[PDB]
Amino acid sequence: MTHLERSRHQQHPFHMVMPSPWPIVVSFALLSLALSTALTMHGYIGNMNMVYLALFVLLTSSILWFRDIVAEATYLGDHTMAVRKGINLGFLMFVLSEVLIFAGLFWAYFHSAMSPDVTLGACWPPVGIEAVQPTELPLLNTIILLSSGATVTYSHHALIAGNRNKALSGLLITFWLIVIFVTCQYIEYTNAAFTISDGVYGSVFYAGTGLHFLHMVMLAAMLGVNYWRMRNYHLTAGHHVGYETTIIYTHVLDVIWLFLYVVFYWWGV
């Protein structure tokens, strides 16, 4: 084509982002959250009202940031294939950083488990603490993640194919499947013989399973956002990077749950 209407464009595929006020606001909110939760843990302020509003302003600033990124990604239309591969590799490295936090928690469990202290009775699990048996409720909420992975992968491969009634049905039932997982996980927490303070076993057990618990409620929020922008026709057939992102996230969450489940419920009892 003409040079005159070729030099009226970006001249390189990469993103040039206009100056946006959502690093500074969410950093302000992160500072206020850190100081208020360092200040209310010692009885300096009266209630948890202020750490509540600090967590809430962090949540609503970050959801306004994600509003800005979905508007820029599908309305202004800048996410070409180079930027798509960039944000894909960035999410891969972020999740590689999350699984190392999980590896640090597993290091804590292994170090205090396979060399048990003389104050635990020199046996893992310790004396008196009735450990959770792995075959009742752990079996349901370890088969429900495999069923969730199967239905989210056929919803993905129906989104690439072209049918809407299947690619929406898979996403709806994987959302309700993992929220049923989260609710029965809370059911498992609210009747268990040990608390987070009862020894080191309850401490590292609840640390690992609670971090996975918070990770899948964040996954459920991500999948609710993805179902909303799948219903409102944002997701295309070949430009769904914000959905490939969350299916990569839920499959690696499934495999880190099975690692956590095996060595937290079978070997550790």
Binding site: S20, P23, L35, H42, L96, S97, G104, A108, S203
Partner: protein, 534 residues
């Protein structure tokens, strides 16, 4: 101007702000080093009368402020943010709001670290903030919680910068940059950004375990209750050695570039040098417990770690040998960043030799938590990372800032910091092998001489930084007059021998990376079009 400095998703105007917080926090940290070494100058309770808790607060402030708010910003954040898009031809970095939030969550870690040293006398543990010294029984208050929330925020900043750097040099390279054609500082920032996201997750997990067994009644390291404090030493030093390899690898990149461009020679075997640097990176995880030879490990695992830290020692050796090889046979133009590059080699080889004296698990029983260790790391961290930082500033800031500095003041600043910092940390070795422990307010008055000599040196090392501040001022208000009126050096690469002056004015800059071809202060959209390479 509010949208150019507060929102500002452009990787050139974030690095200047990184550098501003870097010089601010480095001034605060060296004020703390001056106060520490001013109180340790003589036995008996000096300037701060009694009050050892205040000295513990001052030494943890000096250590953690000058590590996580001067060296890591002014090497990773500032220099990577300004130069990593500007060497591989990206217009600027990928994920721009991510390295804006990294900068903007730095100084709130700084302000909560500052206000942690005021409430309920204060967090005194040292920068390796240990249990049960920091648990709620032996240390009550909201001080160390803010002191480790600062580490949470700095940890988040450095990881976001790491993901930013990794993707912006794995995808947005220019037309001809292959997988091995990048300049070596790009490779250093590459490997450092890998070690960040491979290391500091373990750190943040361990220190949030410390926080929720302080305040949330859990029992990770509270020992009467099941836990053990050795698990924190493992979970901390698994980051604690990759942290200083993170702090020193861009120093190796900066020194490689300045000795390449001030000796008119390419670096001797750049491919073997980057293989050595990458193996140093992937090997620096396997030696994390050379800081724990005393606590009660077996002799077998101590034998493994004292075997593996010497194979850590060898590729740094072949890097220093390649540096001697690439300054050999050159045409060395002794300007002020080349002086820092020459001093870095000697003053880091000295610290590395005393480091491999420390690395023997046999020999670490006579030297642990002892001023020999301070003499080692205040060589290889201080002189290493900050002589590379000075050889970064005095070499790059005429191109970035666009104002040429004064030259004779830069050389008296180099010789003052060189003399006045070699006189501090050299008596620390004699204090170490004579038997002085670390973190004491002061000491049994036998070894009363070397502390006085180190304290008379720290004032020289502070006066040289005051002269560096005046160098910044004289650069900022007399830049064009130092261009014109013959006080500076203008061409960093001299004309060759048989080349005329009328022929040097044709090809002015004989670079090998992009950065010295952009005009002084460069355009906000420098690479409109891509920068081709064969």
């Amino acid at each position: 101007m509010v949208q150019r400095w507060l929102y500002s998703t452009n990787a050139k105007d974030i690095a200047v702000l990184y550098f501003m917080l870097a010089i601010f926090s480095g001034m605060a940290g060296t004020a703390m080093s001056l106060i520490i070494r001013l109180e340790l100058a003589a036995p008996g309770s000096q300037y701060l009368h009694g009050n050892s808790q205040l000295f513990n607060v001052l030494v943890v402030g000096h250590a953690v402020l000058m590590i996580f708010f001067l060296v890591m910003p002014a090497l990773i954040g500032g220099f990577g943010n300004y130069l990593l898009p500007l060497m591989i031809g990206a217009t600027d970095t990928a994920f721009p709001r991510i390295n804006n939030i990294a900068f903007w969550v730095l100084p709130m870690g700084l302000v909560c670290l500052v206000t942690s040293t005021l409430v309920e006398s204060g967090a005194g543990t040292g920068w390796t903030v240990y249990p049960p010294l920091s648990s709620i029984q032996a240390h009550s208050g909201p001080s160390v919680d803010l002191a480790i929330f600062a580490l949470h925020l700095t940890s988040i900043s450095s990881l976001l910068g790491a993901i930013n750097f990794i993707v912006t040099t794995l995808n947005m390279r220019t037309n001809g940059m292959t997988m091995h054609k990048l300049p070596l500082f790009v490779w250093s920032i590459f490997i450092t950004a890998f070690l960040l996201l491979l290391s500091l997750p373990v750190l943040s997990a361990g220190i949030t375990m410390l926080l929720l067994d302080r305040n949330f009644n859990t029992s990770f390291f509270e020992v009467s209750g099941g836990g053990d404090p050795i698990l924190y030493e493992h979970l901390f030093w698994f980051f604690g050695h990759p942290e200083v390899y993170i702090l020193i690898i861009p120093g190796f990149g900066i020194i490689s570039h300045v000795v390449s461009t001030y000796s008119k020679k390419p670096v001797f075997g750049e491919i073997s040098m980057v293989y050595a640097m990458a193996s140093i990176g992937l090997l620096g995880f396997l030696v994390w417990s050379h800081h724990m030879y005393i606590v009660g490990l077996d002799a077998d695992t101590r034998a493994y770690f004292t075997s593996a830290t010497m194979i850590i020692a060898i590729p740094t050796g072949i890097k220093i040998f390649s540096w001697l090889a690439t300054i050999h046979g050159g045409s060395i133009r002794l300007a002020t960043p080349m002086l820092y590059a020459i001093a870095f080699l000697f003053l880091f080889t000295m610290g590395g030799l005393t480091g491999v004296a420390l690395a023997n698990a046999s020999l670490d029983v006579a030297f642990h938590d002892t001023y020999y260790v301070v003499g080692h790391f205040h060589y290889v961290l201080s002189m290493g990372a900050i002589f590379s930082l000075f050889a970064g500033y005095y070499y790059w800031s005429p191109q970035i800032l666009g104002l040429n500095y004064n030259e004779k003041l830069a050389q008296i600043q180099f010789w003052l910091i060189f003399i006045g910092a070699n006189v501090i940390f050299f008596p620390m070795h004699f204090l170490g092998i004579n038997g002085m422990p670390r973190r004491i307010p002061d000491y049994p008055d036998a070894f009363a001489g070397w502390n006085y000599v180190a304290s008379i040196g720290s004032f020289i090392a502070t006066l040289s930084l005051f002269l560096f501040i005046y160098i910044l001022y004289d650069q900022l208000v007399n830049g064009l007059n130092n261009k014109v009126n013959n006080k500076s050096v203008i061409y960093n690469k001299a004309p060759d021998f048989v080349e005329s002056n009328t022929i040097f004015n044709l090809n002015t800059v004989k670079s090998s990376s992009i950065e010295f071809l952009l005009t002084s202060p460069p355009a906000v959209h420098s690479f409109n079009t891509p920068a081709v390479q064969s």
